[PDB]
Scaffold this active site. Structure first.
Site, PDB file in Angstrom:
ATOM      1  N   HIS A  14      -7.871  -5.348  -0.234  1.00 22.66           N
ATOM      2  CA  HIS A  14      -6.586  -4.671  -0.186  1.00 22.66           C
ATOM      3  C   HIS A  14      -5.922  -5.164   1.108  1.00 22.66           C
ATOM      4  O   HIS A  14      -6.584  -5.275   2.148  1.00 22.66           O
ATOM      5  CB  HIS A  14      -6.835  -3.157  -0.126  1.00 22.66           C
ATOM      6  CG  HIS A  14      -5.594  -2.329   0.008  1.00 22.66           C
ATOM      7  ND1 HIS A  14      -4.575  -2.352  -0.919  1.00 22.66           N
ATOM      8  CD2 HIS A  14      -5.231  -1.416   0.941  1.00 22.66           C
ATOM      9  CE1 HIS A  14      -3.639  -1.487  -0.565  1.00 22.66           C
ATOM     10  NE2 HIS A  14      -4.015  -0.905   0.559  1.00 22.66           N
ATOM     11  N   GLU A  43      -9.114  -5.206  -4.616  1.00 20.91           N
ATOM     12  CA  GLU A  43      -8.589  -4.087  -3.831  1.00 20.91           C
ATOM     13  C   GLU A  43      -9.662  -3.152  -3.291  1.00 20.91           C
ATOM     14  O   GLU A  43      -9.775  -2.942  -2.082  1.00 20.91           O
ATOM     15  CB  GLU A  43      -7.629  -3.255  -4.690  1.00 20.91           C
ATOM     16  CG  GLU A  43      -6.423  -4.012  -5.240  1.00 20.91           C
ATOM     17  CD  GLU A  43      -5.252  -4.039  -4.274  1.00 20.91           C
ATOM     18  OE1 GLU A  43      -5.431  -3.642  -3.104  1.00 20.91           O
ATOM     19  OE2 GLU A  43      -4.147  -4.461  -4.686  1.00 20.91           O
ATOM     20  N   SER A  70       0.845  -1.192   0.000  1.00 21.02           N
ATOM     21  CA  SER A  70       0.000   0.000   0.000  1.00 21.02           C
ATOM     22  C   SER A  70       0.884   1.247   0.000  1.00 21.02           C
ATOM     23  O   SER A  70       1.664   1.444  -0.926  1.00 21.02           O
ATOM     24  CB  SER A  70      -0.928  -0.012   1.216  1.00 21.02           C
ATOM     25  OG  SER A  70      -2.023   0.869   1.022  1.00 21.02           O
TER      26      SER A  70
END
Ligand SMILES: [K+]
Length: 485
Positions: A398, A309, A188
């Protein structure tokens, strides 16, 4: 075996647990407090005695949004948070590969010492050294004040990361690692940070391999950084002639001012706020453009995203944004015609905004970065598809791959309330083995996966799931819509 190691700034003493040597809370920079707040990281003062390195140092001050979910017992918070932790396998083997972790958290949350990032299992199973670290977050690390004083540095958090990598290059051999075989990996915001590190002057020559998980080139303009900086000082009631106040105001007040600026700004679909900023001194240009021109020549890259995600960015009850908002996100991300055409790919709806986050914040950037680097180094791409079958956590959200990479599967219970089945343990072994082999050789292939190199002619991609498969030019229709004809 008593684990005393001499670092460039002094001796540190760790311990050994279940076949893994561990050193925690090692200072890699002078605490960025007072006059050092908003300035590039400085070397810590040397010490002549033995520093006890058996406990983690404080984490950077931040809202409890992630800490409350990541920890069972909250950590101490302090601007005095620049520490690295080292996990090494107890083995006669020397010059071990080194994997340095850069945590995610939207540039304002997280810590290298979160339970999920404990490097004991990775170190033991792969016989590699794992380094975790903290870098300045939110108002302390991503409030770019260069426009107010040249003495201040922008992208402070990234400079901290580079300083930690410099520390690794200069000290890891003393811990049994090979300073010339350092793999930086992150997820991320950590992946986005690595995109920048691959192009930053401050990080030149500080690592030899990179793994970018759900994160790629991401920056705000120099103009945006300056406007936000001015708004920040206004909230704090600090004038251009009262800059000294920036070094005396309480950390809590900096956090409040930061939170106040967010609420004042209508949240966007990507939930972006703090992020790296273009700046001549620290980040001259967009990471993707720099890599496309060879800035990271010869640095192997393992990069990927999860299939779903965007499902972590909305709820089944989230409000449906206007078409104008989506079209604005398209123009921003894509461009002039690319936004025009392919716009019909996201008709107003909850589904479309979820897909837009997955596609524009993660997938397109990953494919663009991977494609760019493929002309200068070996590149390997993956898409993570796994997730429990039963709702509502039946999506490859995610960050869902993190527990598998580190082997700390308790994280799956809090992320998806998933049970630690044999399939889960097997998938973790496969993914971890691939990450380890990549760190060792620059090729992630294992006995479970003969990984094909990713290049623009075939775009071969490995699909990570209970059963490993390979897709050639996955989502080709979507790719053709999101890239120039
Ligand atoms: K010893």
């Amino acid at each position: 075996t008593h684990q005393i190691v001499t670092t460039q700034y002094g001796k540190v003493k760790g311990t050994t647990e279940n076949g893994v040597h561990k050193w925690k809370g090692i200072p890699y920079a002078k605490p960025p407090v007072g006059q050092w707040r908003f300035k590039a990281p400085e070397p810590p003062e040397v010490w002549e005695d033995v520093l006890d390195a058996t406990a983690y140092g404080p984490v950077c001050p931040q809202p409890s949004d992630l800490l409350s979910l990541s920890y069972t017992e909250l950590p101490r918070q302090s601007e005095d948070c620049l520490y690295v932790n080292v996990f090494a396998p107890d083995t006669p083997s020397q010059n071990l590969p080194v994997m340095v972790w850069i945590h995610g958290g939207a540039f304002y949350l997280g810590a290298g010492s979160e339970p999920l990032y404990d490097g004991s299992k990775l170190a033991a199973q792969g016989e590699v050294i794992v380094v975790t670290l903290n870098y300045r977050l939110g108002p302390f690390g991503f409030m770019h004040l260069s426009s107010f004083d040249e003495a201040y540095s922008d992208n402070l958090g990234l400079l901290d990361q580079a300083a930690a990598l410099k520390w690794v290059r200069e000290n890891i051999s003393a811990f049994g690692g090979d300073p010339d075989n350092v793999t930086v990996f992150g997820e991320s915001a950590g992946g986005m940070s690595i995109a920048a590190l691959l192009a930053m002057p401050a990080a030149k020559g500080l690592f030899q391999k990179a793994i970018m998980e759900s994160g790629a080139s991401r920056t705000m303009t120099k103009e945006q950084a300056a406007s936000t900086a001015a708004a920040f000082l206004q909230v704090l009631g600090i004038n251009e002639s009262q800059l000294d106040r920036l070094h005396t105001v309480a950390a809590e007040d900096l956090l409040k001012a930061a939170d106040q600026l967010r609420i004042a700004e209508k949240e966007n679909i990507f939930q972006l706020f703090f992020q790296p900023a273009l700046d001549p001194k620290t980040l001259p240009e967009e990471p993707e453009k720099s890599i496309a021109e060879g800035a990271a020549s010869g640095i192997p890259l393992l990069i990927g995203t999860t299939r779903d995600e965007g499902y972590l960015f909305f709820t089944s009850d989230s409000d449906v944004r206007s078409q104008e908002t989506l079209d604005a996100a398209l123009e921003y991300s894509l461009g002039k015609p690319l936004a025009e055409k392919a716009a019909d790919l996201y008709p107003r709806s909850l589904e479309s905004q979820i897909h837009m986050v997955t596609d524009l914040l993660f997938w397109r950037p990953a494919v663009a970065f991977a494609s760019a680097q493929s002309h200068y180094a070996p590149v390997w791409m993956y898409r993570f598809d796994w997730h429990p079958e039963k709702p509502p956590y039946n999506k490859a959200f995610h960050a869902l791959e993190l527990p598998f990479v580190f082997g700390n599967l308790d994280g799956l219970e809090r992320m998806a309330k998933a049970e630690i089945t044999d399939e889960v343990k097997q998938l973790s072994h496969t993914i971890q083995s691939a990450w380890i082999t990549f760190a060792k050789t620059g090729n992630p292939s294992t006995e479970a996966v003969n990984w094909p190199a990713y290049h623009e002619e075939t775009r071969e991609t490995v699909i990570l799931d209970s059963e490993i498969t390979i897709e050639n030019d996955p989502e080709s229709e979507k790719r053709q819509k999101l890239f120039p004809s």
